[PDB]
């Protein structure tokens, strides 16, 4: 509901068959048959979950669909599987080192599934009668919990009374108590007992009285990443650092102890390891120290599958003074397999543009689609994809529903691409600030 239409919202996964053969147009993915087949092979390895630490480099020219292929892999991966999509610039931080940030990105992409059984008694409290013991030990209580339908009486122990007096629950408060584990919550105050007070308190919350059965059974599946366990065991109250982010370079011995405990919890069967994918978009923006740490960190058994994206040619590696293919050193490319994405022809440009126009609910005419395809082949895919929405707004300002040739031509005239802007800058270089800072603001001499 909150999500708007983004650049990759039309992709619902890799458009493959059961034989890992890509369809020409399926699930929002058009073309790139070799790349989609290779990504389908990658997805199966993640789904097998029996091998660890493979580095996959998605390489190609820009606007060819490396990030589109990564989002297709993430959508085909399904839910409750840890997919961590980060950029290469996020590793450089201020209170975390680059290796520690890479370790946190690695351990956020592999988790454990844990099954929980809850016997929840949810209802409004009618009366709490406390049997006051003479010695004070084993304080018996009588809880009158009540739903819309029906109401029982529960016996309450001393720690139950201490938990129900630690948080302030009174008559008319909606609480649910777990029978197996004794978990305590306070959902708030019932709406039936809401008008008795003229002004509500600071922490007073109003919730509806639950209906149906008083006690309900539910099975809850929790997917907890390894980084979550690291942050929890790093501090006394570590759950705040899961959200505020000031974890602060978790020491190694916590990580080895957590790895050994995850192994023994696996061997006794109360949790199961779910591996996932860590996707580093624009991986060329990383230091050589980051690349060396990636090279050593891919060899652990608790390591996810690493998909890296690069649009660089033979470029200078960051942190050094020599050039390298993909902006990556040769020992990183040694422990990697490369998926190459190619450019699109006119039919693939037209199909992707039609899919993006259908996603944004824009009614493109045939001549407007042909003009946008010609502009996409001439300039770029992303220029025509950005031109579609402003042409839609131009046509809507003209009191028209569908777009025509004139709306696309007006959007082409109003908004420039890279080559036209380069030509306009190079024709009048005195009006812009040079690399030496020189400029001519004066219009006459």
């Amino acid at each position: 509901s909150l999500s708007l239409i983004a650049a990759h919202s039309h992709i619902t996964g890799l458009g493959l068959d059961e034989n890992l053969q890509p369809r020409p147009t399926s699930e929002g993915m058009v073309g790139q048959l070799q790349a989609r087949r290779a990504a389908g092979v990658i997805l199966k390895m993640v789904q097998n979950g029996t091998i660890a630490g493979r580095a996959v480099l998605v390489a190609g020219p820009p606007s060819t669909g490396k990030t589109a292929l990564a989002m297709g892999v993430s959508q085909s991966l399904g839910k409750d599987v840890p997919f961590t999509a980060i950029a290469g610039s996020e590793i450089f931080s201020l209170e975390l080192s680059k290796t520690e940030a890479l370790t946190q990105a690695f351990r956020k992409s592999i988790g454990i599934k844990i099954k929980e059984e809850t016997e929840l008694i949810e209802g409004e409290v009618v009366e709490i009668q406390i049997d006051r013991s003479i010695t004070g030990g084993h304080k018996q209580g009588k809880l009158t919990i009540k739903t819309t339908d029906m109401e029982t009486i529960y016996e309450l122990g001393n720690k139950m009374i201490d938990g129900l007096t630690k948080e302030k629950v009174l008559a008319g408060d909606v609480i649910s108590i777990d029978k197996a584990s004794g978990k305590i919550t306070k959902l708030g105050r019932s709406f039936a007992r809401s008008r008795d007070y003229d002004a509500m308190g600071a922490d007073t919350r109003f919730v509806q009285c639950p209906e149906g059965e008083l006690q309900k059974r539910k099975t809850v599946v929790h997917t907890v990443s390894l980084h979550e366990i690291d942050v929890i065991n790093s501090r006394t109250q570590g759950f705040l650092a899961l959200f505020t982010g000031d974890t602060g370079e978790i020491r190694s011995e916590v990580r080895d102890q957590i790895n050994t405990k995850v192994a023994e919890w696996k061997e006794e069967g109360k949790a199961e390891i779910v591996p996932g994918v860590l996707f580093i978009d624009e991986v060329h923006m990383l230091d050589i120290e980051c690349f060396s740490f990636i090279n050593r960190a891919l060899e652990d058994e608790f390591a996810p599958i690493v998909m890296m994206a690069t649009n660089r040619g033979v470029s200078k590696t960051r942190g050094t003074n020599y050039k390298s293919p993909h902006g990556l050193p040769l020992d990183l490319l040694d422990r990697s397999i490369i998926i190459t994405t190619k450019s699109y022809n006119e039919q693939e440009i037209k199909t992707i543009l039609s899919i993006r126009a259908q996603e944004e609910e824009v009614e493109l005419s045939s001549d407007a689609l042909d003009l946008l395809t010609k502009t996409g082949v001439e300039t770029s895919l992303r220029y025509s994809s950005n031109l579609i929405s402003v042409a839609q707004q131009i046509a809507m300002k003209r009191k028209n529903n569908t777009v025509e040739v004139e709306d696309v031509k007006r959007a082409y005239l109003l908004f420039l691409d890279s080559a036209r802007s380069v030509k306009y800058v190079q024709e009048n270089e005195s009006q812009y600030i040079d690399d030496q800072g020189n400029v001519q603001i004066s219009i006459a001499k």
Binding site: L4, D198, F243, N386, L414
Partner: protein
């Protein structure tokens, strides 16, 4: 008397109902094509459908890129969020620059929440706490009284705790918010002002209005406000603390888990109809000051599902990108980001619209300029720069006022040109002189 800034005279894009830019309308003159492009952009923003759209305003200095950005801001209205920013502001020494960019991204997505404000104001006449033990009080009966009459309320022990926090006794005008539960003691009434001849009590009058007052308000928050509301390393934002806490809270890298939880809570409140989502504009002037790492994170963050419309400004040409060594790119923006942009070209001016800009700035600053003085100012603007005349307009008015004249004359313009120099004359003085000017 209102002050005048550099962009005070601009009230909007000056377009009609058909989107065609009127030549002189809305504080603008000329620049019709970029104004129409910005009108298409604000129509796209008002559609409230797209995310991550990016437009770059490219043109020379003193051509109106920031003018068009603030014109977009007035065309959208104060309801739509607008985050103006400089590319230099992302370099923080507390948190990393990509986190600052993502925080400014979340600062441009807002929420409207309709809410009620109900207030009980007046002097406490009765304060009777009913205990009904099961030590612990059951409730408290509080009788407030103003000049229009009295009213009795039943309050929970939390509000009784807040009342006894404020040292509220019988005879004190107090303030109670029914929804929040906040209790504020205004002070003792003047009916009890003569119990002693001298005491530390602050004696305030009885409220002239009713005890109970209810009204409707709207809360305009952002997603960054809700992000920093529940991401505190040291909590306690609810308590009123005039003095600072003993440990200074520092800006931290907010994880994506809090962003997803905040998004889930906001979507749940939107699906109930309580809150309304308003996508807005993040404007970055002087985008050439961004590092290549910030450009890479901008490339990653423009593909988010909740990203706002980003408007970038630059005045450079074929320039090396900051943080690189040999990447010659237009406007200082790398070509991978440029592929995601829509470029709006900003044209220079000629003499006539420079003259009308000068006369519009003179009319807004309430200065009377004679016609030949206006022609001299326009000729100086064509010769030196437009902003030189726009900044010499006010010394001309001061030199006219010190000679007891309300009309700027040609001699005032000559005196202001003699007293204050432009960049070219000062550069000539710099070049001719030897000992550091």
């Amino acid at each position: 008397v209102t002050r005048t800034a550099a962009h005070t005279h601009i009230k909007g894009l000056g377009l009609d109902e058909s989107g065609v830019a009127k030549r002189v309308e809305g504080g603008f003159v000329g620049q019709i094509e970029a104004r129409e492009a910005c009108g298409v952009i604000v129509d796209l923003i008002k559609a409230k459908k797209m995310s991550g759209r990016a437009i770059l305003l490219a043109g020379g200095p003193s051509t109106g890129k920031t003018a068009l950005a603030l014109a977009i801001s007035q065309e959208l209205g104060p309801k739509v969020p607008f985050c103006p920013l400089v590319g230099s502001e992302l370099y923080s020494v507390e948190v990393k620059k990509t986190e600052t960019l993502m925080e400014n991204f979340r600062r441009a997505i807002g929420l409207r929440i309709k809410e009620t404000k109900e207030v009980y104001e007046g002097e406490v006449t009765e304060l009777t706490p009913e205990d009904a033990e099961n030590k612990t009080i059951s409730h408290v009966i509080v009788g407030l009284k103003s000049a229009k009459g009295t009213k009795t309320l039943r309050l929970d022990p939390t509000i009784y705790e807040s009342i006894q926090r404020e040292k509220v006794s019988i005879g004190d005008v107090i303030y109670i918010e029914a929804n929040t539960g906040a209790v504020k003691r205004v002070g003792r009434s003047d009916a009890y002002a003569t119990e002693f001849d001298l005491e530390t009590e602050e004696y305030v009058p009885l409220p002239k209005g009713e005890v109970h007052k209810k009204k409707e308000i709207v809360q305009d928050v952002t997603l960054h406000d809700l992000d920093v509301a529940n991401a505190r390393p040291q909590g306690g934002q609810d308590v009123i603390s005039m003095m600072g806490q003993l440990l200074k809270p520092k800006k931290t890298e907010i994880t994506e888990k809090l962003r997803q939880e905040v998004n889930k809570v906001v979507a749940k409140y939107i699906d109930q109809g309580v809150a309304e989502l308003i996508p807005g504009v993040l404007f970055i002037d002087e985008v050439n000051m961004l590092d290549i790492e910030i450009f890479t994170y901008l490339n990653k963050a423009l593909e988010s599902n909740i990203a706002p419309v980003v408007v970038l400004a630059s005045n450079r040409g074929m320039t090396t990108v900051r943080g690189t060594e040999d990447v010659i790119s237009p406007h200082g923006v790398p070509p991978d980001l440029i592929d995601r942009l829509l470029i709006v070209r900003t044209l220079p001016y000629d003499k006539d619209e420079i003259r009308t800009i000068i006369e519009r700035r003179a009319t807004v600053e309430r200065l009377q300029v004679e016609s030949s003085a206006l022609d001299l100012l326009a000729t100086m603007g064509t010769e030196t720069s437009l902003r030189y005349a726009l900044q010499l307009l006010a010394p001309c008015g001061i030199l006219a006022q010190t000679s007891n004249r309300k009309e700027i004359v040609v001699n005032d313009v000559n005196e202001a040109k003699l007293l204050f120099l432009d960049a070219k004359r000062s550069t000539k003085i710099l070049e001719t002189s030897a000992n550091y000017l």
